[PDB]
Enzyme design. Structure first.
Site, PDB file in Angstrom:
ATOM      1  N   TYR A 263      44.145  46.412  38.808  1.00  0.00           N
ATOM      2  CA  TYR A 263      43.523  46.130  40.114  1.00  0.00           C
ATOM      3  C   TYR A 263      43.565  44.644  40.416  1.00  0.00           C
ATOM      4  CZ  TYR A 263      39.941  45.923  43.773  1.00  0.00           C
ATOM      5  OH  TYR A 263      39.309  45.699  44.940  1.00  0.00           O
TER       6      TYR A 263
ATOM      7  N   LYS B 224      45.960  42.944  43.361  1.00  0.00           N
ATOM      8  CA  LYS B 224      45.315  42.245  44.494  1.00  0.00           C
ATOM      9  C   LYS B 224      45.679  40.768  44.442  1.00  0.00           C
ATOM     10  CE  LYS B 224      43.412  45.862  46.455  1.00  0.00           C
ATOM     11  NZ  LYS B 224      43.924  46.281  47.769  1.00  0.00           N
TER      12      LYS B 224
END
Lengths: 227, 227
Positions: free
Chosen positions: A136, A140
């Site tokens: 994650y 990002k």
């Protein structure tokens, strides 16, 4: 005496998630035309290559110019490099957030209106290393870099185009409520505040500088959008 | 009177590229056992999922512990979000550099020796936005973040493990020579200097702090490795 306007068109990626539905509702109340590429839900195969996404995206907006391309796709999974399942979960977050963002940038570049908006979704938590959220944080972080890189050559965007990434901390989603059901929600950002900010930028006003990483900061249940 | 040593084992990813071959030659002169996962060349399908890479990587080192996992895979392609071919070229650089690095981290975590080395390959140019190299800058930026994130929780690495990323500027490769055949090469790093530095770190000495982004800086044909 009478001057005919034109519909504004948004290409919305990630319409099926909590923030995606809040964003669709805000554009619809704002009388925009919405092209929801991911809908009619799971309409585009997640196993799509970047080339296949940009084909599905070009095809959904044929003979339109788009005033906004809004990418709010992406779920969340945990995991360290210790877990065997980090491989599969990180590939999913890369496909949902980064593959989608690269394809969205190309459609924005080729079908986008002057003063148009490309909006990508990052994560405030990816401003720092994320050992417990490898996939994650990496996906990002890459979106943040991609946003800065796109902004850094305006000659391949429409005139007066803006690229922005939103960096939420915690969003007030049904998932967050059931995961943390006795926590204080005074720092959780309302989905409607984010959606209304996105529509306001898409209508043309209050945009920070192109390439900005806009942190969404909620304190005592009031939200600011900070570069 | 006699004390039997043990072979050191390196898992080498990217053995077929210029830096990969220089690194294989340095480990071999250094009397290491080399497992070249990508060889006997294109041995692992680039279309592999992260899960499939980590399976091919676990399978290549079964019943060994690895003192080093060295990932030097990755080619180079240009392109802005303007070019339709940026989608395909960026997916390739993500697969060669980032997919490989996530899988390599899991094998390092589960099969790696105490004081072991995981080495990932970034790019000095990805320290800044890269508008003309969207795919390459985004993939290498992600490797840098992944390196910092892995380092930030030592409890899931072998005891006294180090994770490092190398950030070359320009390497003296056959490709670079034929692309820029009348340029000054006084700032181009010799592949043998990089390979010898990698072996020295893999033998245990001169390692900067785990999570370091080590820039390779060549001036007047002499190289330093700088954090």
């Amino acid at each position: 005496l009478y001057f005919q306007g034109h519909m504004k068109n948004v290409l919305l990626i990630g319409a099926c998630g909590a923030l995606g539905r809040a964003v669709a509702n805000a554009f619809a109340k704002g009388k925009w035309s919405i092209i929801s590429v991911d809908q009619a839900c799971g309409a585009v195969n997640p196993a799509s290559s970047i080339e296949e996404l940009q084909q599905a995206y070009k095809s959904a907006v044929t003979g339109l110019k788009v005033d906004a391309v809004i990418n709010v796709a992406g779920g969340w999974a945990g995991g360290s490099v210790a877990d065997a399942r980090t491989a599969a979960s990180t590939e999913l977050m890369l496909r949902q957030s980064l593959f989608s963002s690269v394809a969205a940038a190309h459609v924005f570049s080729t079908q986008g209106e002057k003063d148009g908006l490309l909006l990508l979704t990052g994560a405030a938590a990816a401003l720092s290393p994320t050992p417990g959220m490898i996939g994650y944080g990496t996906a990002k972080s890459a979106v943040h870099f991609l946003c800065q890189s796109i902004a850094a050559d305006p000659s391949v965007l429409p005139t007066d185009a803006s690229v922005l990434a939103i960096l939420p901390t915690i969003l007030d989603t049904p998932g967050n409520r059931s995961a943390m059901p006795h926590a204080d929600r005074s720092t959780w950002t309302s989905l409607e505040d984010v959606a209304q900010q996105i529509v306001e930028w898409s209508n043309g006003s209050r945009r920070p500088a192109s390439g900005s990483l806009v942190k969404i900061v909620t304190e005592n249940s009031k939200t600011r959008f900070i570069v």
